Coordinates of C-alpha atoms and ligand atoms in Angstrom, one line a residue:
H1 CA 0.0 0.1 0.0
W2 CA 1.1 3.5 -0.3
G3 CA 4.2 5.0 1.2
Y4 CA 7.1 7.1 0.3
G5 CA 9.7 4.1 -0.8
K6 CA 11.0 3.2 -4.0
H7 CA 8.1 0.8 -4.7
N8 CA 5.1 2.5 -3.2
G9 CA 6.1 6.2 -3.3
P10 CA 4.7 9.5 -4.9
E11 CA 5.4 8.5 -8.5
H12 CA 3.1 5.2 -7.9
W13 CA 0.1 7.1 -6.3
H14 CA -1.7 7.7 -9.4
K15 CA -2.4 4.3 -9.9
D16 CA -4.8 3.9 -6.8
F17 CA -5.6 7.7 -6.7
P18 CA -5.8 8.9 -10.2
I19 CA -6.6 12.5 -8.8
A20 CA -2.6 12.7 -8.4
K21 CA -2.6 13.9 -11.9
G22 CA -5.5 16.4 -11.2
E23 CA -5.7 20.0 -11.6
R24 CA -5.1 21.5 -8.1
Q25 CA -2.6 19.1 -6.6
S26 CA -0.4 20.4 -3.6
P27 CA 2.2 21.2 -2.8
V28 CA 3.4 23.6 -5.7
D29 CA 6.5 25.9 -5.7
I30 CA 5.9 29.3 -4.4
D31 CA 7.4 31.8 -6.9
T32 CA 7.6 34.9 -5.0
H33 CA 8.0 37.1 -7.8
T34 CA 5.0 36.2 -9.6
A35 CA 2.6 35.7 -6.6
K36 CA -0.2 38.3 -7.1
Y37 CA -0.2 40.8 -4.0
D38 CA -3.9 41.0 -3.4
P39 CA -5.2 44.0 -1.1
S40 CA -8.8 42.6 -0.2
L41 CA -7.2 39.6 1.7
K42 CA -8.1 40.1 5.2
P43 CA -5.8 39.1 8.2
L44 CA -5.7 35.7 9.8
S45 CA -7.8 34.9 12.8
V46 CA -6.0 32.3 14.6
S47 CA -7.9 31.3 18.0
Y48 CA -5.8 28.7 19.7
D49 CA -6.2 30.0 23.4
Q50 CA -8.9 27.1 24.2
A51 CA -7.5 24.3 22.3
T52 CA -7.7 20.7 23.7
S53 CA -5.0 18.2 22.5
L54 CA -5.7 14.5 23.5
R55 CA -3.4 12.5 21.9
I56 CA -0.4 11.9 19.7
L57 CA 0.0 8.7 17.4
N58 CA 2.3 7.2 15.0
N59 CA 0.3 6.1 11.9
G60 CA 3.0 4.8 9.9
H61 CA 3.2 8.1 7.7
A62 CA 3.9 10.8 10.2
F63 CA 3.1 11.2 13.6
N64 CA -0.1 13.0 14.5
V65 CA -1.3 15.2 17.4
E66 CA -5.2 15.4 17.7
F67 CA -7.5 17.8 19.0
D68 CA -10.8 17.6 20.5
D69 CA -12.9 19.2 17.7
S70 CA -16.3 19.1 18.9
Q71 CA -17.0 22.5 19.9
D72 CA -15.2 25.8 18.3
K73 CA -12.2 25.5 20.4
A74 CA -9.3 26.3 18.2
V75 CA -10.5 28.0 15.1
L76 CA -9.1 29.6 12.0
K77 CA -11.3 32.4 10.3
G78 CA -10.1 35.7 8.2
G79 CA -7.6 35.3 5.5
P80 CA -9.0 34.1 2.3
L81 CA -11.8 31.9 4.1
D82 CA -15.3 32.7 4.7
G83 CA -16.3 30.4 7.4
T84 CA -14.8 29.1 10.7
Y85 CA -12.5 26.3 10.3
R86 CA -11.8 24.0 13.4
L87 CA -8.6 22.4 14.2
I88 CA -8.5 18.6 14.3
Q89 CA -4.8 17.7 14.1
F90 CA -1.4 18.8 13.0
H91 CA 1.8 16.7 11.8
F92 CA 4.9 17.3 10.0
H93 CA 6.8 16.3 7.1
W94 CA 10.4 16.2 7.4
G95 CA 13.6 14.9 5.6
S96 CA 16.7 12.8 6.2
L97 CA 18.9 15.7 5.9
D98 CA 18.2 19.4 6.7
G99 CA 18.1 20.6 3.3
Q100 CA 14.9 18.7 2.4
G101 CA 11.5 17.8 4.2
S102 CA 9.3 20.8 3.2
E103 CA 6.5 19.9 0.8
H104 CA 6.2 23.5 -0.6
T105 CA 9.1 25.2 -1.5
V106 CA 9.7 29.0 -1.6
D107 CA 11.5 29.9 -5.0
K108 CA 12.6 26.1 -5.3
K109 CA 14.1 26.5 -1.9
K110 CA 13.1 23.7 0.4
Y111 CA 13.2 23.7 4.2
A112 CA 14.1 20.9 6.7
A113 CA 10.4 20.4 7.3
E114 CA 6.8 21.5 7.2
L115 CA 4.2 21.7 9.8
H116 CA 0.6 21.3 8.9
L117 CA -2.3 22.4 11.2
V118 CA -5.4 20.9 9.5
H119 CA -8.8 22.6 10.1
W120 CA -12.3 21.6 8.5
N121 CA -15.2 23.9 7.4
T122 CA -18.0 23.9 10.3
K123 CA -20.5 24.4 7.8
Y124 CA -20.4 20.9 7.0
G125 CA -21.0 19.2 10.1
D126 CA -18.3 16.7 10.6
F127 CA -14.5 16.2 9.0
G128 CA -16.0 13.5 6.9
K129 CA -18.5 15.7 5.4
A130 CA -16.1 18.6 4.7
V131 CA -13.7 16.4 2.6
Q132 CA -16.4 16.1 0.2
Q133 CA -16.0 19.9 -0.4
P134 CA -14.1 21.9 -2.5
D135 CA -13.9 24.4 0.6
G136 CA -13.8 21.7 3.1
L137 CA -10.6 22.2 4.7
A138 CA -8.0 24.8 5.4
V139 CA -4.4 23.5 6.2
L140 CA -2.1 26.1 7.6
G141 CA 1.4 25.0 6.7
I142 CA 4.4 26.6 8.4
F143 CA 8.3 25.9 7.3
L144 CA 10.6 24.9 10.0
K145 CA 14.2 25.7 9.6
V146 CA 17.4 24.3 11.6
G147 CA 18.6 26.9 14.2
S148 CA 18.0 27.4 17.9
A149 CA 15.5 25.3 19.7
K150 CA 11.7 26.1 19.8
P151 CA 10.6 25.6 23.0
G152 CA 7.3 24.9 22.3
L153 CA 8.2 21.8 20.3
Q154 CA 10.2 20.2 22.8
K155 CA 7.3 18.8 24.6
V156 CA 6.3 16.7 21.5
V157 CA 10.0 15.7 21.0
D158 CA 10.0 14.2 24.5
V159 CA 7.2 11.8 23.9
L160 CA 8.5 10.4 20.6
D161 CA 9.7 7.5 22.4
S162 CA 6.3 6.1 23.5
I163 CA 5.3 6.2 19.8
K164 CA 8.2 4.7 17.9
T165 CA 6.2 2.5 15.7
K166 CA 3.2 2.2 13.4
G167 CA 0.3 2.0 15.4
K168 CA 1.3 3.2 19.1
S169 CA -0.2 6.3 20.8
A170 CA 0.1 8.2 23.9
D171 CA -2.0 10.5 25.6
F172 CA -0.9 14.4 24.9
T173 CA -3.1 16.5 26.9
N174 CA -2.8 20.3 27.5
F175 CA -0.6 21.0 24.4
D176 CA -0.8 24.4 23.5
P177 CA -0.2 25.0 19.6
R178 CA 0.4 28.8 20.0
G179 CA 3.8 27.8 20.6
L180 CA 4.4 26.5 17.3
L181 CA 3.5 29.8 15.6
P182 CA 6.1 32.3 13.7
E183 CA 5.5 36.1 14.8
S184 CA 4.2 37.1 11.5
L185 CA 1.0 35.8 10.3
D186 CA 1.8 37.1 6.5
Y187 CA 0.7 34.4 3.9
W188 CA 0.4 33.2 0.7
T189 CA -2.8 31.3 -0.2
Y190 CA -4.0 29.2 -3.3
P191 CA -6.3 26.2 -3.8
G192 CA -5.0 22.4 -3.8
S193 CA -5.4 19.2 -2.3
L194 CA -3.9 17.1 0.5
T195 CA -0.6 15.8 -0.1
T196 CA -1.1 12.3 0.8
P197 CA -3.8 9.8 -0.5
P198 CA -6.5 10.0 -1.0
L199 CA -5.1 13.1 -2.8
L200 CA -8.7 14.9 -2.6
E201 CA -9.0 18.6 -4.0
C202 CA -10.6 20.2 -0.7
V203 CA -8.0 22.5 0.4
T204 CA -7.4 26.2 0.8
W205 CA -3.5 26.3 1.4
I206 CA -2.5 29.2 3.8
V207 CA 1.6 28.9 3.7
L208 CA 3.1 31.5 6.1
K209 CA 6.0 33.6 5.1
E210 CA 7.9 33.7 8.3
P211 CA 9.4 29.9 9.0
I212 CA 10.0 28.8 12.6
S213 CA 13.3 27.6 13.4
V214 CA 14.0 24.4 15.6
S215 CA 17.4 23.0 16.8
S216 CA 19.1 20.1 14.7
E217 CA 18.6 18.0 18.0
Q218 CA 14.9 18.6 18.0
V219 CA 14.4 17.6 14.2
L220 CA 16.7 14.6 14.8
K221 CA 14.5 12.8 17.2
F222 CA 11.8 13.1 14.4
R223 CA 14.0 11.1 12.2
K224 CA 14.3 8.2 14.9
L225 CA 10.5 7.4 14.3
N226 CA 9.4 4.3 12.5
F227 CA 7.4 3.5 9.4
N228 CA 6.8 -0.1 10.3
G229 CA 5.0 -1.7 13.1
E230 CA 6.9 -3.2 16.0
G231 CA 8.5 -6.8 15.4
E232 CA 8.4 -5.9 11.4
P233 CA 12.2 -4.7 10.2
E234 CA 12.9 -1.5 11.0
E235 CA 12.3 1.2 8.4
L236 CA 13.3 5.0 9.6
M237 CA 10.4 7.5 9.1
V238 CA 12.3 10.1 6.8
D239 CA 11.7 11.8 3.6
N240 CA 7.8 11.5 3.9
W241 CA 7.0 14.5 1.9
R242 CA 5.5 14.7 -1.7
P243 CA 7.6 16.5 -4.6
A244 CA 5.8 19.7 -5.9
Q245 CA 3.3 19.7 -8.5
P246 CA 2.3 21.9 -11.4
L247 CA 0.5 24.8 -10.7
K248 CA -1.4 24.8 -14.0
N249 CA -3.9 27.7 -14.2
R250 CA -4.0 28.6 -10.4
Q251 CA -2.7 31.9 -9.1
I252 CA -0.8 32.2 -5.5
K253 CA -2.1 35.4 -3.7
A254 CA 0.0 37.2 -1.3
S255 CA -1.3 39.3 1.6
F256 CA 1.9 41.2 1.6
Ligands
AL4_1 C1 -1.9 9.7 6.2 C2 -3.0 10.2 5.8 N1 -3.2 11.8 6.0 C3 -4.2 12.5 5.7 C4 -5.5 12.1 6.7 N2 -6.5 13.3 6.2 C5 -7.8 12.4 5.9 C6 -7.8 12.1 4.6 O1 -9.0 11.3 4.5 C7 -10.2 11.9 4.4 S1 -6.3 14.4 6.9 O2 -7.2 15.4 6.4 O3 -6.3 14.6 8.2 C8 -4.9 15.0 6.1 S2 -4.3 16.6 6.0 C9 -3.1 16.2 4.9 S3 -2.0 17.2 4.4 N3 -0.6 16.7 4.3 O4 -2.4 17.6 3.0 O5 -2.0 18.4 5.4 C10 -3.0 14.8 4.9 C11 -3.9 14.0 5.5
HG2 HG1 -12.9 17.9 -1.9
ZN3 ZN1 0.8 17.3 5.7

């Protein structure tokens, strides 16, 4: 089944998910010089002060931190959105080396990792209905560069030991997502897809201009995770990112 390896990685995905060859696939290259500055873009409203994290899980592709999304606790509004989009989970894509790992690139430059805070449009009642819709999800993507440590990421890094293999989970309450955000909320937005199967074209992508930096020690621990379940041969979870897709008749708008 799908993965990121030679025999089941992104170049084979079209065989089970034909939408891989679609018209608004993600990620894309953000070419900063032809992104259209649009002055009617409102600022982002990120309200993560009441967020409830419940769990972290290694799902054999990445590890996810899930949040309680049954009431409007952590929401995203503003920006290019019309509607309140509720936080359900966040995860990352990262590389085996520091010069690769982001899915989106800025002027063909790749970062060491990328954070995806996944939200779904509440108009649609549950997550599973929102993925049937062209404006069902909004994913806020944040690039991570290697540098000094991000204090807020360390709590996540300490637990990775209990979720080393496919299928392990640990309770992970009281995590505040606000410590993973950059100072600036300037962005680029465009319509796209999930970057993993089923590759659905539901997503408004809001990629932030400003990256966060994390130490090389923090991102090192990401790399010690496993794609396999326990008892199966060890296969390190690295380079779990999809390469950039053709923009083909889409315009990237800039809020700045
Ligand atoms: C391993 C599978 N990951 C996906 C699980 N999703 C549910 C998909 O089936 C309805 S999802 O909405 O949470 C997302 S968002 C996302 S990315 N990288 O584009 O932000 C990938 C996935
Ligand atoms: Hg969709
Ligand atoms: Zn992702």
